[PDB]
Amino acid sequence: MKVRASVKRICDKCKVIRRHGRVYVICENPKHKQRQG
Amino acid sequence: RRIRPRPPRLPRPRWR
Amino acid sequence: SRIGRLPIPVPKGVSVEVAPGRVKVKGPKGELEVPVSPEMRVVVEEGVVRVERPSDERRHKSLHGLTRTLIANAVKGVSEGYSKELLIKGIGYRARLVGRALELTVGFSHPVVVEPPEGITFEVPEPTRVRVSGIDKQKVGQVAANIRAIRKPSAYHEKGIYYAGEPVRLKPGK
Amino acid sequence: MKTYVPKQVEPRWVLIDAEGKTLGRLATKIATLLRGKHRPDWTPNVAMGDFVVVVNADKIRVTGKKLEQKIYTRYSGYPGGLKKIPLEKMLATHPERVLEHAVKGMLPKGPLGRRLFKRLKVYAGPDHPHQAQRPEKLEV
Amino acid sequence: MKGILGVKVGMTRIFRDDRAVPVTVILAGPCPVVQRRTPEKDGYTAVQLGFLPQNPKRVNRPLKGHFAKAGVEPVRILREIRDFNPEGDTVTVEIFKPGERVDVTGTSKGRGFAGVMKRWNFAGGPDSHGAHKIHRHPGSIGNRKTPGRVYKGKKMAGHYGAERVTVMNLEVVDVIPEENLLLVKGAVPGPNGGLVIVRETKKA
RNA sequence: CGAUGUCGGCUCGUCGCAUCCUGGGGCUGAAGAAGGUCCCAAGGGUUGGGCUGUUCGCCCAUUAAAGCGGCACGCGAGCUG
RNA sequence: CGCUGAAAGCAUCUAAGCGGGAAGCCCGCCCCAAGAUGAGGCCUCCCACGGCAGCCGGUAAGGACCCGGGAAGACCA
Ligand SMILES: [Mg+2]
Ligand SMILES: [Mg+2]
Ligand SMILES: [Mg+2]
Ligand SMILES: [Mg+2]
Ligand SMILES: [Mg+2]
Ligand SMILES: [Mg+2]
Ligand SMILES: [Mg+2]
Ligand SMILES: [Mg+2]
Ligand SMILES: [Mg+2]
Ligand SMILES: [Mg+2]
Ligand SMILES: [Mg+2]
Ligand SMILES: [Mg+2]
Ligand SMILES: [Mg+2]
Ligand SMILES: [Mg+2]
Ligand SMILES: [Mg+2]
Ligand SMILES: [Mg+2]
Ligand SMILES: [Mg+2]
Ligand SMILES: [Mg+2]
Ligand SMILES: [Mg+2]
Ligand SMILES: [Mg+2]
Ligand SMILES: [Mg+2]
Ligand SMILES: [Mg+2]
Ligand SMILES: [Mg+2]
Ligand SMILES: [Mg+2]
Ligand SMILES: [Mg+2]
Ligand SMILES: [Mg+2]
Ligand SMILES: [Mg+2]
Ligand SMILES: [Mg+2]
Ligand SMILES: [Mg+2]
Ligand SMILES: [Mg+2]
Ligand SMILES: [Mg+2]
Ligand SMILES: [Mg+2]
Ligand SMILES: [Mg+2]
Ligand SMILES: [Mg+2]
Ligand SMILES: [Mg+2]
Ligand SMILES: [Mg+2]
Ligand SMILES: [Mg+2]
Ligand SMILES: [Mg+2]
Ligand SMILES: [Mg+2]
Ligand SMILES: [Mg+2]
Ligand SMILES: [Mg+2]
Ligand SMILES: [Mg+2]
Ligand SMILES: [Mg+2]
Ligand SMILES: [Mg+2]
Ligand SMILES: [Mg+2]
Ligand SMILES: [Mg+2]
Ligand SMILES: [Mg+2]
Ligand SMILES: [Mg+2]
Ligand SMILES: [Mg+2]
Ligand SMILES: [Mg+2]
Ligand SMILES: [Mg+2]
Ligand SMILES: [Mg+2]
Ligand SMILES: [Mg+2]
Ligand SMILES: [Mg+2]
Ligand SMILES: [Mg+2]
Ligand SMILES: [Mg+2]
Ligand SMILES: [Mg+2]
Ligand SMILES: [Mg+2]
Ligand SMILES: [Mg+2]
Ligand SMILES: [Mg+2]
Ligand SMILES: [Mg+2]
Ligand SMILES: [Mg+2]
Ligand SMILES: [Mg+2]
Ligand SMILES: [Mg+2]
Ligand SMILES: [Mg+2]
Ligand SMILES: [Mg+2]
Ligand SMILES: [Zn+2]
Incomplete structure (x- = not known):
C-alpha cells in the first residue's frame, strides 16, 4: 500500500x-491501493 | 554533537 | 434508481411484524430480528412490506436503502435461506465432515477443525466442495469468509480455498 | 447598617436522578447546590450549600464521540507515571468517578472548596443508603 | 487454591534417577482452621490457618477468645489463604503430592542498610587510575537544571532484605506425611526456622 | 563577567521516535528461502576487542540487532583529568 | 484484511451494525499500600468507676517501661 x-x-x-x-484509493490492480497520510 | 570544538571560558580554578 | 422505495415481496406465508427499532420476520426456516432506525418507517401492506424516509437528506436517503435490503435479506432468509460454496483446489487439499464440525486438510502440519456457530449448517458433497448453509445472510458470508481465510487463494498457483465462481487470476513465477 | 450574615443554618438534602442527563449540564447545577448560591442568605466564607445525593450515575449521558475520546489522566510522580484512561472504561470500572470528577473541577479550590466535594454523594444504580436524611427529590 | 503455613528447616540434596536434586525441607503441617472468610460476612473468600501450638500463658484474652469461637488450642501464628475453603478443618501436607508445583512465600534474609552495589548491582568506580573515594559510590543521580530534581523510585542505598519474597513454580519433590515434612526443589526465601507459606503454583 | 567550571571517558540513568532487532502489516520487478519498499509499534533489547585524549570513524570476532537523538553538546557540591 | 450494506439500480470494510488483527494498551503475575482524612471490612476482649461532646483522679481488656536476646537492626523500629 x-x-x-x-x-x-x-x-x-x-x-x-x-x-x-x-x-483511500482502492482498485483491482493492487499496486494502485492508496491511503492518505 | 557539536563539530567545531567549543573553547573553554574558565581557566582551571587556580590555588590563590 | 432507488433501492429504499422498491417494495419487498413477502412470500406465503412469512410474517413480518413491526416494533420500535426492530421488525420480526418469522418463517418456515426460522425467525430473524431486523433492527430499524426509528427515523425510517416500516409499513406492512398486503403480502408486501414497504420502507419510507421522513425527509430527503443524506442520512435518510442512506438509512432507506439499507433498512430495505435488511428486511429483504431477512425475508429470503426465513423462506429460501442462504448458502455459499467453497472450492478446494490443490493436490493435497480436501475436507470432510465429522458429525457437525468441518475438518479441513489444506497442507499444514495439521488439519483445521471449524465448529459451526448457531444457525449454521456444514455440508460436504465432494471432498473439494464445502457448503455453508444458514438462514442469516450476514452470518453465512461471515463463516464462508472465515473458512476461505484458513487457506486463501494463492497468488502463484491454483491451490487454496476459492469462492464459488471466484476467478483465478494468477501472476507469473518465472 | 451592615449586611446580614446568618446564624449558621442546618443544611438541606437533595436527590437527583442522573439518568439521561448530560454530564456537564448536571455538574453545573450540582456545583451550585453545593455552594449554596441558590440561597438568599449566601455567605462565601462558610459551607451552607445543600447535601446532594446523585443516583444512576452510571447512566450519565454524553454528547459527541467522548466515550472513546475523553481521557481522564493521572500522574503518579515516577518517570512514566502518566496514565491515560478513556471515559468508556472509567464508566465500566468506576462509574461514580465520572460525575465526581466533573463536579469537582467546578467547585472552588481551597479548604472550603474541597470540603464541599465531601457533601456530594454520588451513587451508581437506582438506590442510595442515605435514607436517614430523607432527601427532597429535586428536578434539574 | 490450596495453601499451608510452615517453617523452613534447611537444605540438602536427595538423589533421584541418577541425578542429585537440590532441595529445601519445610515442616509444613499441620494447620487447624480457626476462621473462615465468606462473601456474606467478609466480601471475599479465604481460610484463616494457624500454626505451631503456643503456651496458653502467653496469649492475651482477646486472642484467646478468638481461638475459642473455633475450638482451636492457642497457636503461635495465624495466617489466611485466599480462595481456599478446605473440606476438613485441618490442612496438612497431604494436599500436596510429588510432581506438583508450588509457590513459596517467605520473609527474606535482611541485609540491613545496603550500599548501592549489594542492593542494586551497580558497578561502582575504578579501583585505581585516579578514582577518588568513590569506589563503592553510585555516580550521578540526575541531570542538571532540567528537571533539576531526582526521579521518584531512584535506586539508591538503604535497607535491603527482611521483606516478603515469593519464589514461584517450585517442584514438590516429596512429602513425608508422618513427619509433616515437605521437600521442595531449589531455593526458598527466608532463613532456617523462618515461617513460609506454601501454595499451589500459578504457572503452567 | 560582586563566576552559569568548560571536550572525552566512567558511573547512574530517563525521555522522544524520523524503529537497528524482536512483534503486526500492505505493495513487490514476492516461486521458495532470502531481499527491497512503505505502514503500525517505543514493551524489552541493542556484544567484546585493535587504533587515536578523542566524540566520530575505520578495523577484528560476533550477533536477533550491533538505531539515531533530547535532557546546560544530561550528569566535576558524583569520580576522572 | 474482511462480513453484511446504502446514500449512488452498479460498486464500496461504514454512512446503521459485526467479525478478525501486534512483543504494544487494559486486566492477569510479583511487591508496596486505608495519612484511600474518602482514614474501609471481619474475628475477638474490657465495659454501666468515683468527685465539681468538660475536668481531675482510681481501674478494666490491653499497652509501655526495665531486663535476656535475635540471619531484625546505624539509633529508632
Ligand atoms: Mg474497483
Ligand atoms: Mg504522485
Ligand atoms: Mg562532542
Ligand atoms: Mg584568591
Ligand atoms: Mg444489495
Ligand atoms: Mg503435509
Ligand atoms: Mg460557599
Ligand atoms: Mg459518546
Ligand atoms: Mg481563586
Ligand atoms: Mg510470612
Ligand atoms: Mg549485588
Ligand atoms: Mg542484589
Ligand atoms: Mg543479586
Ligand atoms: Mg566497568
Ligand atoms: Mg569493581
Ligand atoms: Mg587526585
Ligand atoms: Mg588528591
Ligand atoms: Mg569525593
Ligand atoms: Mg582510594
Ligand atoms: Mg553540578
Ligand atoms: Mg522543574
Ligand atoms: Mg525491613
Ligand atoms: Mg521449567
Ligand atoms: Mg543452618
Ligand atoms: Mg519461628
Ligand atoms: Mg561571565
Ligand atoms: Mg569585574
Ligand atoms: Mg553573586
Ligand atoms: Mg562566587
Ligand atoms: Mg557560583
Ligand atoms: Mg574508546
Ligand atoms: Mg519488524
Ligand atoms: Mg514481521
Ligand atoms: Mg514487508
Ligand atoms: Mg518469501
Ligand atoms: Mg525469487
Ligand atoms: Mg512511525
Ligand atoms: Mg522499543
Ligand atoms: Mg596492544
Ligand atoms: Mg592530538
Ligand atoms: Mg576522528
Ligand atoms: Mg546481520
Ligand atoms: Mg532477521
Ligand atoms: Mg562495538
Ligand atoms: Mg542516550
Ligand atoms: Mg555537556
Ligand atoms: Mg572536579
Ligand atoms: Mg567532565
Ligand atoms: Mg554545582
Ligand atoms: Mg596528574
Ligand atoms: Mg593536560
Ligand atoms: Mg460488499
Ligand atoms: Mg459503523
Ligand atoms: Mg477474516
Ligand atoms: Mg479481538
Ligand atoms: Mg514474550
Ligand atoms: Mg501485604
Ligand atoms: Mg485505618
Ligand atoms: Mg492494610
Ligand atoms: Mg485523593
Ligand atoms: Mg477532614
Ligand atoms: Mg480501620
Ligand atoms: Mg469493604
Ligand atoms: Mg532476619
Ligand atoms: Mg534495635
Ligand atoms: Mg538490640
Ligand atoms: Zn487503478
Whole structure:
C-alpha cells in the first residue's frame, strides 16, 4: 500500500473512497491501493 | 554533537 | 434508481411484524430480528412490506436503502435461506465432515477443525466442495469468509480455498 | 447598617436522578447546590450549600464521540507515571468517578472548596443508603 | 487454591534417577482452621490457618477468645489463604503430592542498610587510575537544571532484605506425611526456622 | 563577567521516535528461502576487542540487532583529568 | 484484511451494525499500600468507676517501661 499526501486515481478502474476519516484509493490492480497520510 | 570544538571560558580554578 | 422505495415481496406465508427499532420476520426456516432506525418507517401492506424516509437528506436517503435490503435479506432468509460454496483446489487439499464440525486438510502440519456457530449448517458433497448453509445472510458470508481465510487463494498457483465462481487470476513465477 | 450574615443554618438534602442527563449540564447545577448560591442568605466564607445525593450515575449521558475520546489522566510522580484512561472504561470500572470528577473541577479550590466535594454523594444504580436524611427529590 | 503455613528447616540434596536434586525441607503441617472468610460476612473468600501450638500463658484474652469461637488450642501464628475453603478443618501436607508445583512465600534474609552495589548491582568506580573515594559510590543521580530534581523510585542505598519474597513454580519433590515434612526443589526465601507459606503454583 | 567550571571517558540513568532487532502489516520487478519498499509499534533489547585524549570513524570476532537523538553538546557540591 | 450494506439500480470494510488483527494498551503475575482524612471490612476482649461532646483522679481488656536476646537492626523500629 502507498501512503502519501497526494492520493490520486492512476487508471480508469481506480476508485476513491473515504472510510474512517481517511481518503483511500482502492482498485483491482493492487499496486494502485492508496491511503492518505 | 557539536563539530567545531567549543573553547573553554574558565581557566582551571587556580590555588590563590 | 432507488433501492429504499422498491417494495419487498413477502412470500406465503412469512410474517413480518413491526416494533420500535426492530421488525420480526418469522418463517418456515426460522425467525430473524431486523433492527430499524426509528427515523425510517416500516409499513406492512398486503403480502408486501414497504420502507419510507421522513425527509430527503443524506442520512435518510442512506438509512432507506439499507433498512430495505435488511428486511429483504431477512425475508429470503426465513423462506429460501442462504448458502455459499467453497472450492478446494490443490493436490493435497480436501475436507470432510465429522458429525457437525468441518475438518479441513489444506497442507499444514495439521488439519483445521471449524465448529459451526448457531444457525449454521456444514455440508460436504465432494471432498473439494464445502457448503455453508444458514438462514442469516450476514452470518453465512461471515463463516464462508472465515473458512476461505484458513487457506486463501494463492497468488502463484491454483491451490487454496476459492469462492464459488471466484476467478483465478494468477501472476507469473518465472 | 451592615449586611446580614446568618446564624449558621442546618443544611438541606437533595436527590437527583442522573439518568439521561448530560454530564456537564448536571455538574453545573450540582456545583451550585453545593455552594449554596441558590440561597438568599449566601455567605462565601462558610459551607451552607445543600447535601446532594446523585443516583444512576452510571447512566450519565454524553454528547459527541467522548466515550472513546475523553481521557481522564493521572500522574503518579515516577518517570512514566502518566496514565491515560478513556471515559468508556472509567464508566465500566468506576462509574461514580465520572460525575465526581466533573463536579469537582467546578467547585472552588481551597479548604472550603474541597470540603464541599465531601457533601456530594454520588451513587451508581437506582438506590442510595442515605435514607436517614430523607432527601427532597429535586428536578434539574 | 490450596495453601499451608510452615517453617523452613534447611537444605540438602536427595538423589533421584541418577541425578542429585537440590532441595529445601519445610515442616509444613499441620494447620487447624480457626476462621473462615465468606462473601456474606467478609466480601471475599479465604481460610484463616494457624500454626505451631503456643503456651496458653502467653496469649492475651482477646486472642484467646478468638481461638475459642473455633475450638482451636492457642497457636503461635495465624495466617489466611485466599480462595481456599478446605473440606476438613485441618490442612496438612497431604494436599500436596510429588510432581506438583508450588509457590513459596517467605520473609527474606535482611541485609540491613545496603550500599548501592549489594542492593542494586551497580558497578561502582575504578579501583585505581585516579578514582577518588568513590569506589563503592553510585555516580550521578540526575541531570542538571532540567528537571533539576531526582526521579521518584531512584535506586539508591538503604535497607535491603527482611521483606516478603515469593519464589514461584517450585517442584514438590516429596512429602513425608508422618513427619509433616515437605521437600521442595531449589531455593526458598527466608532463613532456617523462618515461617513460609506454601501454595499451589500459578504457572503452567 | 560582586563566576552559569568548560571536550572525552566512567558511573547512574530517563525521555522522544524520523524503529537497528524482536512483534503486526500492505505493495513487490514476492516461486521458495532470502531481499527491497512503505505502514503500525517505543514493551524489552541493542556484544567484546585493535587504533587515536578523542566524540566520530575505520578495523577484528560476533550477533536477533550491533538505531539515531533530547535532557546546560544530561550528569566535576558524583569520580576522572 | 474482511462480513453484511446504502446514500449512488452498479460498486464500496461504514454512512446503521459485526467479525478478525501486534512483543504494544487494559486486566492477569510479583511487591508496596486505608495519612484511600474518602482514614474501609471481619474475628475477638474490657465495659454501666468515683468527685465539681468538660475536668481531675482510681481501674478494666490491653499497652509501655526495665531486663535476656535475635540471619531484625546505624539509633529508632
Ligand atoms: Mg504522485
Ligand atoms: Mg474497483
Ligand atoms: Mg562532542
Ligand atoms: Mg584568591
Ligand atoms: Mg444489495
Ligand atoms: Mg503435509
Ligand atoms: Mg460557599
Ligand atoms: Mg459518546
Ligand atoms: Mg481563586
Ligand atoms: Mg510470612
Ligand atoms: Mg549485588
Ligand atoms: Mg542484589
Ligand atoms: Mg543479586
Ligand atoms: Mg566497568
Ligand atoms: Mg569493581
Ligand atoms: Mg587526585
Ligand atoms: Mg588528591
Ligand atoms: Mg569525593
Ligand atoms: Mg582510594
Ligand atoms: Mg553540578
Ligand atoms: Mg522543574
Ligand atoms: Mg525491613
Ligand atoms: Mg521449567
Ligand atoms: Mg543452618
Ligand atoms: Mg519461628
Ligand atoms: Mg561571565
Ligand atoms: Mg569585574
Ligand atoms: Mg553573586
Ligand atoms: Mg562566587
Ligand atoms: Mg557560583
Ligand atoms: Mg574508546
Ligand atoms: Mg519488524
Ligand atoms: Mg514481521
Ligand atoms: Mg514487508
Ligand atoms: Mg518469501
Ligand atoms: Mg525469487
Ligand atoms: Mg512511525
Ligand atoms: Mg522499543
Ligand atoms: Mg596492544
Ligand atoms: Mg592530538
Ligand atoms: Mg576522528
Ligand atoms: Mg546481520
Ligand atoms: Mg532477521
Ligand atoms: Mg562495538
Ligand atoms: Mg542516550
Ligand atoms: Mg555537556
Ligand atoms: Mg572536579
Ligand atoms: Mg567532565
Ligand atoms: Mg554545582
Ligand atoms: Mg596528574
Ligand atoms: Mg593536560
Ligand atoms: Mg460488499
Ligand atoms: Mg459503523
Ligand atoms: Mg477474516
Ligand atoms: Mg479481538
Ligand atoms: Mg514474550
Ligand atoms: Mg501485604
Ligand atoms: Mg485505618
Ligand atoms: Mg492494610
Ligand atoms: Mg485523593
Ligand atoms: Mg477532614
Ligand atoms: Mg480501620
Ligand atoms: Mg469493604
Ligand atoms: Mg532476619
Ligand atoms: Mg534495635
Ligand atoms: Mg538490640
Ligand atoms: Zn487503478
